[PDB]
Amino acid sequence: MWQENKSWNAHFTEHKSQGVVVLWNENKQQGFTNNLKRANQAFLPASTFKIPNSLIALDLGVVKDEHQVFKWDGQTRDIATWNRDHNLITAMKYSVVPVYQEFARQIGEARMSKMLHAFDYGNEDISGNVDSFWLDGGIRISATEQISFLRKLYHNKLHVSERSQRIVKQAMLTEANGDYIIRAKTGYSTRIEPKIGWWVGWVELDDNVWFFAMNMDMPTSDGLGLRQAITKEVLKQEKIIP
Amino acid sequence: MWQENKSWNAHFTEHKSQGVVVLWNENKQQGFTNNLKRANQAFLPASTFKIPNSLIALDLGVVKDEHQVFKWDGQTRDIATWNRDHNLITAMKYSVVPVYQEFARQIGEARMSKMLHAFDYGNEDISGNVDSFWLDGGIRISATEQISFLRKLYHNKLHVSERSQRIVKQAMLTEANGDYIIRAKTGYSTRIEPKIGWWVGWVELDDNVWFFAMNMDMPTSDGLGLRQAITKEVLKQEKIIP
Ligand SMILES: O=S(=O)(O)c1ccc2cc(S(=O)(=O)O)ccc2c1
Ligand SMILES: O=S(=O)(O)c1ccc2cc(S(=O)(=O)O)ccc2c1
Ligand SMILES: [Cl-]
Ligand code: NA
Ligand code: NA
Ligand code: NA
Ligand code: NA
């Protein structure tokens, strides 16, 4: 099932960093990682929680579809792309936290807790603030647990409607060409140590899909590009993407 | 509503050919083209008929989902990519006619003709074989008629389920990066003169979507890549993609 390959550490070493990448080959039901222990250590999901959050908001009707416009509240924040109107596509593309904070407020503590229990998501714990618990509360999830959740989403097996799951899988669209399709979500956990950056999702090939979930030490925002860079180096080494 | 911008013909004559490109700004509700007469000229849809064919087959249960495998029939044909198993995603990417010829045969003439009338698709005529009329039968559709069809598809108001339309819009995925997403379908009509090449779809932006339909004279298969090349040149000139 799980096989360890420490070859991939060089890609983390090359950039003064440490992390874990987890790959799952859907067809052959075989997994791969450079660090079995870290692959199963639970961290704050940060903005990768936007995947379950969107599924919940859509299923409950907080968000009717991917065209509904969530208008900027007018407060100028540090990330410039947040200071504009957004729909679910652009909101997820740019990790617009304010938009998902009002989602969490409408969902409320009870329904959020109930949904995460049914999702089997992480430790299912929403302790902390209603609109910030995935950034500084008690919820935790491992990279392998992200793959378990993601595999349910890919196969439309999560407890919410098939429509909700198809809309989110559309919003996760990051990259696509003649070779592959990447649906994925980035995350950056800055409020509680250890500061880490996430990239979870999958790579759709012609006749297979590879699920991946990576996290890495991230002391500042300047290294965020390595989340995608290091992952793609691993995908190139296994001849998944050219 | 429409306006002619014959500046684009320099992108066609540069590659020794003729054609039309039709754009439609969804937000502004304004259309553009380099030749309004060819824009309204109706040709065989060729494999751009895979868009409505896929909707009909999905709505009728001929195709269960985007993951169902359709086994190669063993007959080795001239396009290598056709001689292997496929699903809806790859069968559309490689324009695998045999796979869609089976779809049509199971849909049948009666339901195909009622569905095309419900879609308002072209001249709604399926005269000829039910398994080849979009390649050598009587169906005819213009570039502007493709845009009307595609607009309904984008808005889920075609007369099939919302599920079927979302799946087809998924299978149309051609290209996606941080700047745009292209959902399109290629076509090469070579059984009845004039031999022409199609590219129809739309470009999803952050705050807008641009529908496009284009066709051009294609005497030999060598020039097929100019379908996308010329379209991207127009889109660049109109400050639609960088
Ligand atoms: O609220 S914080 O400033 O801690 C915060 C929250 C989410 C973030 C997501 C990203 S992401 O672009 O990596 O998704 C980057 C920085 C972030 C900072
Ligand atoms: O059956 S034909 O050989 O006439 C035929 C049908 C569809 C085709 C689609 C393409 S595509 O470029 O639209 O994928 C290219 C050649 C084709 C030939
Ligand atoms: Cl998609
Ligand atoms: Na997105
Ligand atoms: Na944090
Ligand atoms: Na179906
Ligand atoms: Na023709």
Q: How many angstroms is the resolution? A: 2.8
Residue of B94, B154, B207 for testing the chain A interface, max A β-carbons within 10 Å? B207
Tokens coding A201: 């999702």
Provide the 8-state DSSP code for A141.
B
User: For residue B141, what is the DSSP state?
Assistant: E
User: Helix or strand or coil: residue B201?
Assistant: strand
Tell me the best of A44, A47, A51, A90 to mutate to test the pocket of ligand 1, counting ligand atoms within 8 Å of each CB and taking the most.
Answer: A47
- Contact in structure between A75 and A62 (CB atoms under 8 Å): no
Answer whether A174 sits within 8 Å of B176, measured CB to CB: yes
Nearest to B173 among A90, A167, A181 (CB): A181
Query: What ligand is nearest to the CA atom of residue A167?
Result: 3
Buried b or exposed e, range B5-25, using 16+ CB within 10 angstroms:
eeebeebbeeeebebbbbbbe
Q: What's the half-sphere exposure (Cβ side, CA atoms, 13 Å) at B161?
A: 11
CA–centroid distance for A224 within its chain: 14
Distance (Å) from the alpha carbon of B238 to chain A's nearest alpha carbon: 22
- CA A136 – ligand 3 centroid, Å: 31
With tokens 């695998």, the residue in question is: B96
Work out the burial of residue A233: count CB atoms within 10 Å of its CB; fewer than 13 is exposed, 13-18 middle, 19 or more buried.
middle
Dihedral sign computed on CA atoms, order B168, B170, B174, B175: positive
Q: Which amino acid is at B123?
A: N
**8 Å CB contact between A108 and A98:** no
The residue behind tokens 């022409």 is B196
The two three-digit tokens of residue A117, written as one number: 């229990």
Q: Determine the 3-state secondary structure of A201 from DSSP.
A: strand
**CB distance B47 to ligand 2 below 6 Å:** yes
- Say yes or no for a CB contact (<8 Å) between B175 and A176: yes
Computed on alpha carbons and rounded to an integer, the radius of gyration of chain A in Å comes to 17
Counting ligands in written order, the one closest to the CA of B174 is 3
CB A211 within 8 A of CB A26: yes
- The residue type at A111: R
Strand pairing report for B2-4 and A209-217:
unpaired
Phi first, then psi, for residue B150 (nearest 5°) are -65, -35
Q: Supply the DSSP string of A202-233, one letter for each residue.
A: EEE-SS-EEEEEEEEE-SSGGGTTHHHHHHHH
Q: What are phi and psi of B146, to 5 degrees?
A: -65, -40
Facing A206 at nearest CB: one of B90, B163, B173: B90
Name the residue at shortest CA distance from atom 2 of ligand 2.
Answer: B190
Closest-CA distance of chain A to residue B120, Å? 25
Radius of gyration of chain B, Cα coordinates, nearest whole angstrom: 17
CA-closest residue to ligand 1 atom 16: A188
**Please, are residues B128 and B104 in contact by the beta-carbon 8 Å criterion?**
no
* Residues B181 and A93 sit within 8 Å (Cβ to Cβ): no
Q: How far apart are CA B76 and CA B145, in angstroms?
A: 35
Which are the contacts of B10, defined by CB distance < 8 A and separation ≥ 6? Answer: none
CATH numbers and ranges of domains, chain B = 2-237 (3.40.710.10)
φ and ψ at residue B90, rounded to 5 degrees: -75, -35
- Map tokens 């109107």 to a residue: A85
C-alpha of residue A182 to centroid of ligand 2, in Å = 27
